[PDB]
Subunit: 465 residues, 4 copies
Amino acid sequence: ALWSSHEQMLAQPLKDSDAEVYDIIKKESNRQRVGLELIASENFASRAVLEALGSCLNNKYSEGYPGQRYYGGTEHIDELETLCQKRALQAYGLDPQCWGVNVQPYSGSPANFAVYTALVEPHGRIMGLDLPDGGHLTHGFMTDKKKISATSIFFESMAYKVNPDTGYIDYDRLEENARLFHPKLIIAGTSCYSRNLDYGRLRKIADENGAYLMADMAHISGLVVAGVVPSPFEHCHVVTTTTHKTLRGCRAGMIFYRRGVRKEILYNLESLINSAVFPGLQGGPHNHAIAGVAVALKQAMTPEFKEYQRQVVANCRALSAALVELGYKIVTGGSDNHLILVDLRSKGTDGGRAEKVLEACSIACNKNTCPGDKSALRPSGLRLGTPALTSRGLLEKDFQKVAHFIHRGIELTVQIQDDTGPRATLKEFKEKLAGDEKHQRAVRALRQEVESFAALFPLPGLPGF
Amino acid sequence: SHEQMLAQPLKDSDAEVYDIIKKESNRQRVGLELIASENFASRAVLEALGSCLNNKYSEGYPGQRYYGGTEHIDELETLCQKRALQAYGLDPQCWGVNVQPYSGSPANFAVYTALVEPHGRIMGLDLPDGGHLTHGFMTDKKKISATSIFFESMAYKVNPDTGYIDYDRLEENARLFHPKLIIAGTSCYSRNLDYGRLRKIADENGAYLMADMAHISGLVVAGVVPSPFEHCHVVTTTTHKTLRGCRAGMIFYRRGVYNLESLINSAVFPGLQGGPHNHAIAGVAVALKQAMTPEFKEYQRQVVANCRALSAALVELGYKIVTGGSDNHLILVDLRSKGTDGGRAEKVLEACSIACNKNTCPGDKSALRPSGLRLGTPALTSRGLLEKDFQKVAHFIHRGIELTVQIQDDTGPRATLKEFKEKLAGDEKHQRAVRALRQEVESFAALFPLPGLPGF
Amino acid sequence: WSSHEQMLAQPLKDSDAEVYDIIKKESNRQRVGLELIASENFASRAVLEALGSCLNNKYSEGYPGQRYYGGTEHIDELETLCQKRALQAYGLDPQCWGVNVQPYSGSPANFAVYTALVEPHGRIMGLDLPDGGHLTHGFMTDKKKISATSIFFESMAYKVNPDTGYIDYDRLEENARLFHPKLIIAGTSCYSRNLDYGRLRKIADENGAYLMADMAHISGLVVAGVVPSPFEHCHVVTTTTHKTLRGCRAGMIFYRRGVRSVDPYNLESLINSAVFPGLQGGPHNHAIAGVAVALKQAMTPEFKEYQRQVVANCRALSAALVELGYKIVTGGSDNHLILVDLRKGTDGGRAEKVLEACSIACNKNTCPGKLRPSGLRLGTPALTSRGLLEKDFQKVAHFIHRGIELTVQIQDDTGPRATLKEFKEDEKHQRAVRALRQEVESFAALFPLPGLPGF
Amino acid sequence: ALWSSHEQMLAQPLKDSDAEVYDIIKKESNRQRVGLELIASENFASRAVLEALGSCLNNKYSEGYPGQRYYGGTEHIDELETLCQKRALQAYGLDPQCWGVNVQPYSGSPANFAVYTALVEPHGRIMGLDLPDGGHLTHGFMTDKKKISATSIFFESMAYKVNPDTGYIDYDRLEENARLFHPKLIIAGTSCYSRNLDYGRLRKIADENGAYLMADMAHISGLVVAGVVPSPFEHCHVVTTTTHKTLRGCRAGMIFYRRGVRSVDLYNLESLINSAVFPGLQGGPHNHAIAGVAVALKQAMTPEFKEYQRQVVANCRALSAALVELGYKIVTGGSDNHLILVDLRSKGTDGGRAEKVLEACSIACNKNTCPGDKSALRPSGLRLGTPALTSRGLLEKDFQKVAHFIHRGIELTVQIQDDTGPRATLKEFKEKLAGDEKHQRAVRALRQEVESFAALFPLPGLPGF
Ligand SMILES: Nc1nc2c(c(=O)[nH]1)N(C=O)[C@@H](CNc1ccc(C(=O)N[C@@H](CCC(=O)N[C@@H](CCC(=O)N[C@@H](CCC(=O)O)C(=O)O)C(=O)O)C(=O)O)cc1)CN2
Ligand SMILES: Nc1nc2c(c(=O)[nH]1)N(C=O)[C@@H](CNc1ccc(C(=O)N[C@@H](CCC(=O)N[C@@H](CCC(=O)N[C@@H](CCC(=O)O)C(=O)O)C(=O)O)C(=O)O)cc1)CN2
Ligand SMILES: *[C@H](NCC(=O)O)c1c(COP(=O)(O)O)cnc(C)c1O
Ligand SMILES: *Cc1c(COP(=O)(O)O)cnc(C)c1O
Ligand SMILES: *Cc1c(COP(=O)(O)O)cnc(C)c1O
């Protein structure tokens, strides 16, 4: 009686099949185009990458690995996953006899948890940079009464902090505490840290306690491939990372691991990690995303990419320099990478407040706590990254105009705080910011300008989509 | 290097990947895709996956985000939840839903974390009886599944003489094990589950009754099988398979009197996941809207019609169908009913371009000799195949099996089936037959449309 | 203040009149009563004499040959001697069996074995409590875990057929395939029958699990060969040193030595390491001494006859209550005890209280499926150590019988909403309680009370 | 067998029922009489106590508690357990409105484990003084590859150390680490520490992390009752202890706990601790031992006992002073209690060697590492306690002659180490002490004068057995 319209329902372009969702995608693209994206974890994926996501690769189930699958008809997915692993090892200049890699993790958090499952039995001890000091949830997060992060729930985690007076990680206190905590694995990775990680030192600390040194290069993965920051692959046993962010691919994760001699006493990391990801934690691999990651890896090895990362770091340096010239304090004085933590205290306000004033001006960036911050209830900083805007073509001069936009945003934030009063609440702040001509007026002007400037730049991706 | 490759198309930026995708699209077109868990996503859905939604981080939930600029992602995730609850005819005052799970397995593990603390006891169908890894799975050594590592799982089996679940033995064993949660869901079970009974057993032990409708999610939306939302406290599911969307998962939960919402939500984040995959959420949304169309409803009826026809055909051809038949989209064929196993069959059928996988089957020689083949109809039905067509498919599979009992008898009974794969290889005689059959199968499958983008 | 040396020497009778009276009042209580609690016995004078030796003063952490303190020469003779006698008493070969005699009690011994062979969260399988299992074999509810074995380990129980009172070895065999136990327990606290160790062994091997026997209740029966030995099939056998072995309170852990499935057993190191530096501290040498003394007495002919008599009495008692129309689970017993199903129209919950008021000691048992104990467990070791024979145990059966008539009596006068109420016996009852108590105590005083004089 | 032989076997005095054993006992008593017992954990139980152990109380099964038993006929055991709890709460000057106590623990280690089980679920975090610094196994013990103490096996333990330069506990580092470890319970108790514990400071640290402060007064329990050292019952939520050692009772343990309002409202320790001991971990109580503990408690409240404890501390002060006058170094310079940790390094040897030379001279005492000691194997010190010998009546003068005996012991230990050859060690040392004349003749001489003097003092007990 039917089955006639059915064929086309599964054939029409998104625009007609569902106007609502399509309308949402179009307003998102406009939003991304006129705004100044400064969130350190954001970037814009190339057309080639996005083009792969929508392929028929979405349809195939390939549980297992090349050579050892559970389904039939994986010949092409096998070339794909294999090809992707080749490029992944290549992109980071790794030798196949000394390194192996898994490309099925669904995202960044899944990769980390998989490595914990494979090498750290349940309740095994894990050590990672404390959250308020730039750490990531997946590195463990708990309070004096509740285990929040799943890494803290299924395992025993204890954090190491950074020196409150330098913003640097306290390798000395980590070394000492590792002897009392007996970690099975130590994490070398940050989410809001503007400096390089002393992997060499961390490696010795691990070896002293027989622990594994796992690096989480999610934020600097792209910087590493381009050689603008030391590689973690020269000290760590395992390296996990997201494939988006500075690597500029689609969302997914990878787990790199050592192979060979640690021929007396060998690395049995491959078997574990692989079994952990499957049949351990994941099910069918998302081949379409694996393709996207593959495409990204190939672009990542081009000189244009190395060029891009070069510029990403230069821009952070210009931004970092301009805000300083304007009197803003930068945690640890500056950066070695794509981001910087601005301690808004030097201006008499917090990132909790600036977060809002700036967002209303189409300048995206998120609040974050600086060393010593009394409460996470009122974070003294703002994290700023350059990958996104640099993928847009902005150069040093441009980022200097950005620093000024951000600056004005902070002044309004302070101007408004003058009214609310010191003891004023955060709810009261948004209230006063939301209901006041003097302010709303300024917000209309700033926003206008910020957007005007953004509109002057291209926006990578499926054309206006 | 003032070059901007951020725009050059895939066909130019990466010919290698481009080829693999082209070769995969042709492979999918000329083959008879019978794997029960596969389907072909619509073009609209795939289109969404490549949108700019890929670029936004929106950790948390609408109303409660950690980032700024989520106005549109909020409208999306919210829209998706509306459609999810709608598709299954659920009342928002009684049901809530989380649409951030990255896949099917992540969704289950999230529910376990939220409702079953570590080491909590879970009960699910034993895998060899059609259960899924994520429902727990272990041995006398390295527990394969993570659900079996961070939790204490004990399985319930199906009657070996009927292929049916032994709800009686589960009821008794639940009194000794004290499960905190019981799973109602299958990966290879041709029948409807007695949710009502499973509900009565959960309550008897204060346990939660979690349904995993991943395999019949599409069947359920179109009302071709009873709904699990009628008895269960929680229902999780993939968004692909019979729902025909992109890969992702969802978690439905009860609201009223009951704080499953808080836990589940906190479990997915900041518990187990990070940034939501908005582009995939969009894809699931698009699929949900198509799932509520009449065209979808008929498609599902057809999917089930085809399964019966196929089942019937293989039966008329003397093949053993576990429990005699099916109420859904799949059937477990008991090999050995022709004198062979799905272990080798999967390999030859595969060489003939007929895709389907072997399956543990009730007890059998577990992993050593899967006395069965699982066959599903969603994928081919999305292609338009009707009963008559599936009748011809049954014959193609049949011939595949005859060519299997063949190479087997021609293979030493010591069965170095780890070379059988090699005896299929090179041996021009079998490779000859493989081609003869493969030819006919591809000619026949090309007669039907391949959903998705163009020849991409 | 200018003394103290006086105090250290003064007899307890002077130093503590309160405790002394308690001891005397407890000794008289034990003398005039009919002790039927299956887990109770009367230690000999020799044993009790050892408990008060100077052995109480030495710390000897570790083992003979490998101590952490100095001056253990004599404690080393002791522990070693005790181990020799322990293996001997059960006719075991040192090349095949080894033993650890430091466990503080029965429950500590089991927990030590679990810790040594079953890492945390390891699965253990044991007889369900209501079916005669012991707490230490795991015990939990739909809601919470009551036993530590159930808290630091994942336990699943196996039940006894509700229609026969017999263990369902079939359902255990099947369930063991789904649960994957790392260790299965062969032992009971209230089961009148012999366990099928051979079958239990065939089931452990099928799952690669260990077969641990808990012979606490029949330890004495085993030494005298009045019941099959668990050392014929089990990898490990734990046990109390009191109960039917008639020693002081303490536990032991026997283990296999040699090769399990060699083809070109290290239970010793593990268990030993588990007891120390694992779970315990300083051994209780004075108690080890008391266990040694009891083991030597356990190998005498006088002990063997005693055990035969213990079983003879149980049969007689069982038979008598049967002829009295009482329900004995599984119809009878192969050992020292029997589970009486008070159905007579009452329960062991209230029975225990009245019989207790009549000076007939025995506790309520959790018969096969209700906080509402349905039966009464009765043991003969204690009274038999007193010299009672069949004829005497026949008169005991009647004393108990009358006790039940006075019980099943107040239950009609009761609520039926019993509870703290029923714990009221009015004089119409107190008078009877006294009439029966007299008759019991007078008969009870016809027999010798082993051990040191109650004064 | 004639039931008269059976009835008599159960009636014969030990001397006749078992010769081997009765003979062992007799040789042990002789040994204890002629030797100088200096091991800090050793003491001599009174006759009254031992007399209680052998009572018929051995026979009764009384699972549960007074008022709520599982067996019938506990009338007298109920007076006993109740009586014992009254005295336990009394001896320490505790008010029943604020404190309760369980007297069924079989020993010291069982009491601690019971408290962990009741208040700290499995894998809960526990913090205790590191073993090498004077901690006890039950407070947790593990290495960088294996959990040894059961406390470390069924729970997550992390230790807090003492300052290597003072021998004092580092309350500052504990405070800091507690914030990263999030302990659920902190242990205030030592096995080899000559100083008082800052319970008030530890209590604040617990409260800062919502943790319970558990004190383990096994070593100073008797000192506390007599008030010669501050009481732990002033700051701790729970106090566990052995009943032997300085309390001079039979082997057993007790668990004291708070009752009433913690600050909430209230304290919920009673139900848990009691449920943990049973049906949790233990079975039938050892009533005969509970009686012994009761008798000891009554003696513990006499003025003779308080007199004894003062003398115990006075003797440690004389002994400590004498060894110092002879040039021996005492960790932390001295002691506030019954023991002292001598750092044999000042003489060029170790407690591993002195342990043996001194034991062969009938002078009992055990080796023990001193702060900083280069990873055990060769522990620098010797622990020395005075309870045992003081219960024997030794006074200041006497303990000065002991110091001299010990001194000579060390010289021999070094005279032979002179033949040793610095590098040649361990198994070789003993081979020389027990293999060449001059020394043996030296040992025979010393030993003799040691035993003679020892035979000049009484020996608490059954007057011979
Ligand atoms: N009912 C049902 N069907 C389903 C699923 C499901 O969850 N349930 N799946 C989900 O949606 C897919 C299958 N997924 C599975 C993935 C892993 C394991 C598993 O048992 N894992 C172990 C042991 C297997 C094992 O090692 N196998 C044998 C033979 C080797 C092997 O690969 N065997 C093949 C061929 C079988 C044969 O002919 O021997 C096999 O399929 O088992 C061994 O001892 O080494 C592992 O090591 O990964 C099982 C099923 C498809 N069909
Ligand atoms: N087969 C057998 N017989 C044996 C033993 C054995 O191990 N096995 N024993 C060894 O050699 C002795 C008995 N020892 C026992 C010790 C504890 C429990 C027990 O069930 N444990 C807890 C449960 C509490 C419990 O879970 N509480 C519930 C209510 C259940 C319950 O029974 N309620 C009341 C009792 C009824 C009443 O008076 O109201 C209660 O206060 O516990 C809760 O509300 O939290 C207890 O305290 O009774 C049973 C027997 C003698 N006979
Ligand atoms: C006992 N002493 C050990 C020592 O160092 O000499 C002890 C105990 C254990 O008691 P036990 O009867 O179980 O052997 C527990 N806790 C402490 C602090 C000490 O000191
Ligand atoms: C396929 C399936 C899953 C898991 O799906 P993935 O996204 O591949 O993890 C979960 N449950 C059931 C019942 C399934 O059939
Ligand atoms: C009595 C008994 C125990 C425990 O003995 P306790 O010394 O009181 O802890 C253990 N197991 C069984 C089978 C028992 O009968």
